[PDB]
Amino acid sequence: TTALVCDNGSGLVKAGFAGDDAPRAVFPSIVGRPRHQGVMVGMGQKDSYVGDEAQSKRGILTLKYPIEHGIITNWDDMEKIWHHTFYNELRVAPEEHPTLLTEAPLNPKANREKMTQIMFETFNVPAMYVAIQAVLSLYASGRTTGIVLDSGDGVTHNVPIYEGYALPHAIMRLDLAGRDLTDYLMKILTERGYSFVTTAEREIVRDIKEKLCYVALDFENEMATAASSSSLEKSYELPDGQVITIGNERFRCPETLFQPSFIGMESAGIHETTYNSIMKCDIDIRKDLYANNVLSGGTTMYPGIADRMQKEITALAPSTMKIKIIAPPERKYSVWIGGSILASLSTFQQMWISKQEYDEAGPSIVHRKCF
């Protein structure tokens, strides 16, 4: 039979059968209970709208993501999300399909063990396998080397790989991602008068960020230009009218990636953690990693980031090496495409964690040889 390539993610759940080009169903991972009282009788009001249904009734819900930073903080809601994904968005019972979840690097063990225990006890799948979210993104590019920066919505991690041999001592995981950029944008919009507070209006700020923000090639020059002319002010229409005008908030929101001091984080930007991740590698594979830097994940879709990052790394790196940044147009679904490719391989067909194996060793089987 065919395998189910699910990809929990944090912000958008992407799923679909193995062997295709794009995920079949992509929908936000939010579960929102209603918060008001409700007076109409017999309206058929449910107790929790999940997935894309709660992005249409969000006016009277309190949306809450069940995955904070890669890790899962609310297991009941995550179980509800998985149940919805299997039964309503794909309509395939899990009793007859292997599953291939994905997990960020350096995550707590208990999260992974609970994930496998749920998949084997509640949904009762035949066999499931957990894979690191960066190796798949390297599969999708058709490479076999390269250092991949997978800046998702929950957590940004940077896994270097050479000739198929991952370097476990050079993984640099940073917890700045799309959600923190949304919060920072929502916080700097208040400097013009627009106040978004409700958890429903966070979605509106996310839409503003997606449609308007861009990464500046040079930050100081843009700050000077936006403060003199008015060629940058782009307007946007809220879900009820009252258009708003975003000035130099456009390139200040995604600039947080390269200067995490804006949101008070100490660490260095995504332009310098890649160079540090390279320098921890051996001295003889640094040229190949320099030449095959891969971008993935949703948050790396800002217009103009593949040039800013290249300029920064070229500034840091030695002058002789060639710096090349692979930015495929299908960046958002790169991890899932790689997952489909991996699940479609014949050599991989014996790596699944078969159910009888789980019955013999318990949920701690995932840390064992079947990784």
Added chain:
Amino acid sequence: TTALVCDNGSGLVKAGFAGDDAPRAVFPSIVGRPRHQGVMVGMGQKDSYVGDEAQSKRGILTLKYPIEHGIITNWDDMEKIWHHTFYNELRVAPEEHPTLLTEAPLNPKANREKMTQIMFETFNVPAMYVAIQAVLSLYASGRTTGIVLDSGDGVTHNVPIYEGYALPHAIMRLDLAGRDLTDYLMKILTERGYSFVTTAEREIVRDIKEKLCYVALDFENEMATAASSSSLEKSYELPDGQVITIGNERFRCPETLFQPSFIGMESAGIHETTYNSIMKCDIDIRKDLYANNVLSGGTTMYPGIADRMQKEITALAPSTMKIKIIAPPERKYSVWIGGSILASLSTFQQMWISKQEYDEAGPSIVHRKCF
């Protein structure tokens, strides 16, 4: 058995069995004791004529409404009105019929508790339920969202509802209604020479208001036109002859709705309390409320109000949203039609306040789960 859908109202009591199209008996709610001495013996003169009987002998009575502004100020008279409604206008003993009263929003608790205590002790009904007068008017329109402006004769209230979930923090109740318009019309008629003082002549002024007054599309232009031409002066024949001619009093009486400063009230008109009630709602359901504005209640029957209100709201609202005002021809009985529909539902059949429940918790049961 069938349920009795009574609707106390303030000015007209509307009642009838559940499941029909129109109330069976509609009659003014006035109780008038005779005031003169009376010399004929054996004429069979009663001590209080209630309902529609006191609108024919009103020449020698002192009519007094038992409901001032939604609240009930004279419980003995209200009990008399209910007794008349049950026994003479419907001729069904209440011992064998559930009842569904209606109550304005934000009313004193003691009023509701006394109402249920009367219905359970004096009339001894099997089960009664109290419902908010705006949710029913939303039932009758066949919608499930929308913000309903129910401008009755006692009190005007504006309850917004979305997807069946009422928003309790956005109810704007204003105490200007048909009765204050009658008093203001009676007060401005004195500018031509016609003086109505007696409580019986208030009924004549009410008839004048119903038959002649209309809401102007633009107030200043109408004031200028009525002051130059004479195309507006419509005449009306009193109950004894001596026709009267109403000039620009025609559109000045109902204009008080949009400018409550005429009768000295501070608050804003019904055109601006609706917009304020909308703006208190969440940012994502404002479009639906804009598109589904519902009118109900008797006082919204003035010829030309559904255009004036739409013009005013379109002036206030953002230019992109579409403003639509639902004004069904059966506006007056909209609340009662909705009450019939609600009482005819199967899902609602277990929400009644059964008598044994009242015996166990006292009259304060109404504030509890059985709302």
Added chain:
Amino acid sequence: ISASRKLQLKTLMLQIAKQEMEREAEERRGEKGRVLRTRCQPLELDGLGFEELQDLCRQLHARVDKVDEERYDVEAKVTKNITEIADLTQKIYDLRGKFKRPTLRRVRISADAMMQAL
């Protein structure tokens, strides 16, 4: 186009549909019996010694546990699927028939000829 055969055609279609429903019920029952026989083998109770009964009932009890697991699984499945079907049916009705539930009325009946009585 005559309204004459509308009644005959709809009655004939109702008869055909009823025959189809009863036939489907009968064939479902027969298939269920066959699947039951091939799953739970028919009970043999002849010439059996007590030890043979002990062993057979032990096998039956192990099978009882196994099939109880199977059936509580399919019972949770059917419960969840029924709930989901009801929810989606009500959602579909809301999208389509919510505007029509109020329209269910018994109106314009008495007041039509109850105006001159006053």
Added chain:
Amino acid sequence: DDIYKAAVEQLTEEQKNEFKAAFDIFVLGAEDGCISTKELGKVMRMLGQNPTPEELQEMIDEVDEDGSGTVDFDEFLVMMVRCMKDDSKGKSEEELSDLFRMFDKNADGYIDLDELKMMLQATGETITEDDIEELMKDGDKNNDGRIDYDEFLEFMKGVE
């Protein structure tokens, strides 16, 4: 063809009250019961009955084609009784959906015309002007290339 015909052959007094009321409205005695379809519809709307002009116009297009303006008692009574809602609510919606899913073998989210033709020929009924394309004409509302159970209701709702 036969349902209202049977009902008239067993003429009930409840309907007979209105029938004879409209008769004395029409026939004043020793008449042939002409009662033209135009006049019949006029009176049907007049005497407080169902004011549906559609059935009246159907009769007018259908009756008094003789050129004498007279309307025989048989068809006049048939159209009077069928003007009123004579149906047992057309069975049950869920039950009829099961009937149609037994009818519909494709289960492609709808049912195609050919399945309807198969069921119709299984019924074994006579064919007339309301055949062949009348179902096609009525059911092709949005012309979705199919006759769904919802489309089948739109064509001939209230199947009894």
Added chain:
Amino acid sequence: GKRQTEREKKKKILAERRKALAIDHLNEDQLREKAKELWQSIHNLEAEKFDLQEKFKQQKYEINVLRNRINDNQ
């Protein structure tokens, strides 16, 4: 993951809450009767299992119907 109640119920039904029955401890006639009871219970319950599979069929039919209706209407 706060479906501990759900999966704990699953395990309880499959192992504990099932008719966990000591059966091979009975008189010859008694043990035969108990075996007959087990056999009948399996038969009736698997008939119910077939019924649930048929309900899965009907639910899938209605799912397909709803999908087609949604697509045609939107």
